[PDB]
Amino acid sequence: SKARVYADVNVLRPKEYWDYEALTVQWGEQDDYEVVRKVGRGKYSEVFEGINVNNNEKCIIKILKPVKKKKIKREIKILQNLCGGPNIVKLLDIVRDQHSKTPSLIFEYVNNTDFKVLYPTLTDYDIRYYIYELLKALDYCHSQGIMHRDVKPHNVMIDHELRKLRLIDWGLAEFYHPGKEYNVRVASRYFKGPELLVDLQDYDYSLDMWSLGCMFAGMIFRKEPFFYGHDNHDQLVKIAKVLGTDGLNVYLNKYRIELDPQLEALVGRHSRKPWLKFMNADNQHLVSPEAIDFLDKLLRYDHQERLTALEAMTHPYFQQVRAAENS
Numbered sequence: 001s002k003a004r005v006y007a008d009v010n011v012l013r014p015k016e017y018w019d020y021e022a023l024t025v026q027w028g029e030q031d032d033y034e035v036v037r038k039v040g041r042g043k044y045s046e047v048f049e050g051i052n053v054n055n056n057e058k059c060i061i062k063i064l065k066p067v068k069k070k071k072i073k074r075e076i077k078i079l080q081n082l083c084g085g086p087n088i089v090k091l092l093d094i095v096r097d098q099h100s101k102t103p104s105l106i107f108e109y110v111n112n113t114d115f116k117v118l119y120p121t122l123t124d125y126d127i128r129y130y131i132y133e134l135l136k137a138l139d140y141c142h143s144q145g146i147m148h149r150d151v152k153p154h155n156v157m158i159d160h161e162l163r164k165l166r167l168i169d170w171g172l173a174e175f176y177h178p179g180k181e182y183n184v185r186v187a188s189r190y191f192k193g194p195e196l197l198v199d200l201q202d203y204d205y206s207l208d209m210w211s212l213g214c215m216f217a218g219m220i221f222r223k224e225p226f227f228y229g230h231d232n233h234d235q236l237v238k239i240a241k242v243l244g245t246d247g248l249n250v251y252l253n254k255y256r257i258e259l260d261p262q263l264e265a266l267v268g269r270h271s272r273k274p275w276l277k278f279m280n281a282d283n284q285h286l287v288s289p290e291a292i293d294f295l296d297k298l299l300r301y302d303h304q305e306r307l308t309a310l311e312a313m314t315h316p317y318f319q320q321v322r323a324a325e326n327s
């Protein structure tokens with residue numbers, strides 16, 4: 001398998017672009033930036049509202065937990081590579097604590113609203129608008145030879161008052177190289193593509209489009225997460241109970257994949273559940289044929305069959321957003 005688009009980006013670029021292991025960090029000044037308040041945390045970092053003491057402007061201070069030097073250079077290089085692109089979070093500085101050498105990544109400040117509280121309030125149009133803003137970031141990063149690999153609401157910072165959106169946490173992101181076999185232990189379970197769940201390792205940018213599809217299904221159906229598996233085998237089963245097993249079988253044989261016996265038995269055999277079966281009185285106001293058509297074209301087992309971020313942006317679902325822009 002190769003990517004259908006942007007496959008040669010890294011081939012054509014100087015090795016310095018994608019050789020993140022050869023990065024030597026230029027450390028800035030740790031006391032330029034003071035923690036004001038914690039705003040988030042995860043397996044790999046803690047994140048604070050901060051202040052730049054020089055100019056008294058807000059910032060975001062992402063303090064990294066102990067991890068391999070490689071994974072740190074990866075995220076930095078990716079961030080520097082994408083700095084300036086549409087709706088991609090801006091890395092302003094990199095610093096460390098002299099004594100312990102714990103890295104902090106310093107970012108533009110974004111004033112997020114938790115999605116679990118924000119998304120209920122989003123109107124039909126809002127959803128079109130923000131998903132389009134997120135597609136800008138994705139087309140940009142793919143165009144630059146990079147896969148996010150962890151698209152999910154938690155990694156999409158939205159300032160609803162200013163209607164500004166940023167794609168955050170490039171910690172799992174990777175450079176796309178034709179043919180390369182990647183670690184499938186990426187993304188977060190509910191947003192993992194079937195490729196990851198069936199150990200197809202030569203995946204690409206398309207992985208992020210599945211993830212996007214999962215996020216989008218959750219928003220329009222008000223069912224978050226959309227695919228709610230308890231473990232990775234169950235994640236595939238939950239998908240197969242919606243997309244049906246035939247599509248799965250076509251897919252497995254195309255890429256010559258054999259499901260280990262236990263998974264194959266868990267998945268079973270299921271007919272397809274049409275997207276309209278998810279509409280109800282909680283979500284009706286957000287379900288439209290254009291939404292469903294767009295969704296349908298994202299959630300495909302075959303990653304080669306999914307819309308590219310470029311393609312998705314032109315889907316008629318987004319036409320008012322696009323027209324609003326072109327004026």
Ligand SMILES: Cc1c(Br)c(=O)oc2c(Br)c(O)ccc12
Pocket residue numbers: 039040045047060062089107108109110111112157168169170171
């Ligand atoms: C702006 C921002 C926020 Br707000 C956050 O909670 O996490 C972030 C992470 Br994790 C990043 O990696 C970059 C920016 C942010």
